[PDB]
């Protein structure tokens, strides 16, 4: 939320209330509706924690993500 | 027709082993420094120590015997 | 829109020479001639 902070902004501070409702609804994607993250300006490397825990149930998740990032170049992919 | 050569190496580096990756890493550094790459050219052996074996144990090849040799100047 | 068928300085292209670490996936990249 602090990446591009406009303190004198009605809309950006209104998104804070929307984030509280998602936190109340038990949503792990609470930071979702922030303007910087949604635009791609900021990501947290804590997402790599989730990619590892998901691999317990989706063993393909690491390979799928790396193929998108190009970290592994399988011929024909 | 240069794409075939481009694709030829691509299918090779994909299947090249980790031993090759380790081997080329060293050779790249040696030719960077200037050492001859030839010479860098694994250990399928198992060794152990037998302190004071009985006088009946057979002596296999490649066995190193520890010795207490007397003092030459004595 | 065509329908989907049921059936089907100059830079050289090459792998980077010095991979900084083991396991670095070799990607075909644009490279300087020298």
């Amino acid at each position: 939320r602090f990446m591009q902070f406009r303190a004198k902004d009605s809309y950006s501070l209104a998104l804070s209330k929307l984030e509280k409702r998602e936190r109340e609804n038990g949503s792990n994607l609470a930071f979702m509706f922030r303007l910087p993250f949604a635009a791609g300006r900021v990501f947290s490397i804590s997402m790599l924690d989730t990619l590892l825990y998901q691999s317990f149930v989706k063993d393909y998740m690491i390979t799928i993500t790396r193929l998108l990032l190009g970290l592994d170049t399988t011929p024909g992919s | 027709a240069a794409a075939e050569w481009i694709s030829q190496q691509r299918l090779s580096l994909y299947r090249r082993s980790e031993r090759q990756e380790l081997s080329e890493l060293v050779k790249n550094r040696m030719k960077h420094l200037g050492l001859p790459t030839t010479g860098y050219d694994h250990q399928n052996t198992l060794s152990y120590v037998l302190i004071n074996p009985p006088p009946d144990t057979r002596l296999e090849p490649s066995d190193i015997v520890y010795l207490i040799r007397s003092d030459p100047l004595a | 829109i065509a329908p989907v068928l049921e059936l089907a300085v100059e830079y050289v292209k090459g792998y980077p020479p010095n991979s900084p670490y083991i396991g670095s996936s070799p990607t075909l990249c644009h490279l300087l001639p020298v």
Side-chain angles (χ1 to χ4, degrees), chain A, chain B residues 1-7 9-74, chain C:
Chain A
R1 34 167 188 172
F2 295 143
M3 154 71 156
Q4 293 178 162
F5 196 77
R6 315 165 183 276
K8 293 179 179 179
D9 201 70
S10 321
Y11 185 85
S12 303
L13 302 187
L15 294 169
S16 178
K17 302 175 308 196
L18 165 59
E19 180 250 11
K20 303 167 148 116
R21 319 217 217 261
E22 314 296 11
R23 289 208 273 96
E24 286 186 13
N25 298 334
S27 180
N28 45 18
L29 282 156
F31 51 83
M32 198 215 268
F33 287 106
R34 298 306 185 160
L35 300 193
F37 162 85
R41 304 273 95 96
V42 178
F43 69 97
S44 190
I45 201 58
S46 308
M47 74 156 270
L48 283 208
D49 290 311
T50 322
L51 181 53
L52 203 81
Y53 313 140
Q54 247 195 310
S55 291
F56 191 39
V57 318
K58 300 140 145 290
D59 63 326
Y60 51 86
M61 294 300 293
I62 287 167
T63 315
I64 285 287
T65 297
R66 300 189 96 231
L67 289 158
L68 283 175
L69 310 180
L71 292 167
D72 57 344
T73 48
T74 296
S77 181
Chain B
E4 291 172 347
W5 178 81
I6 286 298
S7 65
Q9 37 163 228
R10 183 149 154 273
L11 208 29
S12 178
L13 277 95
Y14 163 53
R15 78 184 64 270
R16 93 177 186 280
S17 52
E18 179 143 292
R19 173 99 296 280
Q20 292 181 51
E21 291 184 283
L22 291 160
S23 174
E24 277 137 290
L25 161 67
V26 176
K27 294 173 183 167
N28 286 333
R29 291 284 200 84
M30 311 186 30
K31 73 186 58 171
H32 181 316
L33 306 170
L35 315 168
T37 278
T38 67
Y40 177 84
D41 73 58
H42 221 90
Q43 198 52 17
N44 284 342
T45 63
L46 186 144
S47 307
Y48 51 93
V49 194
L50 278 166
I51 308 179
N52 191 43
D56 58 27
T57 89
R58 291 241 326 161
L59 281 179
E60 279 76 310
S62 68
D63 290 4
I64 285 131
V65 191
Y66 303 146
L67 295 179
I68 306 188
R69 192 173 308 176
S70 35
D71 195 299
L73 318 183
Chain C
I1 298 173
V4 181
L5 303 177
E6 293 177 350
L7 301 177
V9 51
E10 267 48 47
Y11 303 145
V12 317
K13 291 183 183 172
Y15 290 91
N18 300 3
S19 300
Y21 55 98
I22 309 99
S24 176
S25 44
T27 309
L28 199 81
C29 303
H30 298 290
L31 291 185
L32 289 174
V34 170

